[PDB]
Amino acid sequence: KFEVLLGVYTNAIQYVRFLETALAVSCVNTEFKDLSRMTDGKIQFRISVPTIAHGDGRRPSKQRTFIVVKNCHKHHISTEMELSMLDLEILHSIPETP
Amino acid sequence: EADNQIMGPSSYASFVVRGENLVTAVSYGRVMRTFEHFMARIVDSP
């Protein structure tokens, strides 16, 4: 028997993603797909400065290619997902009746 | 405001490979055309 009519209000949440938000402009991001593969915490930088061709002094110099190294940070974000046992036992057995 | 939204990529970039295109020496025309492509791209912006 339809006894009473109750109204509840769930909360709409603006779910965000890293590409959807705006600070992904700053970071050219990749999908490296397994971070155990890189085995050195430093990364070599090949900085190549160009040259300006002076003529009066006749004092030529090549492009003074100098190479420095910089570290690679790593982070570890973790959370929990709370799935119920009965819903997984429902999901394991495919039903056929409506 | 100059706008209200910006066009950005829908997915992360993937790592592409470059260098081990191990096709054989096709002809003299292929190596000459690629040499002209690599050297005449110095003075050409488009």
């Binding site: 050219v28 990749t30 085995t39 050195d40 990364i43 070599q44 | 970039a13 993937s14 790592f15 592409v16 490979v17 470059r18 260098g19 081990e20």
Partner: peptide
Amino acid sequence: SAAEGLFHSFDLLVGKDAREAGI
């Protein structure tokens, strides 16, 4: 360093199909 004795075969570009720089 770490590249003091190894040969490099190819590279892995960050989607730079026409650019050669980047990472």
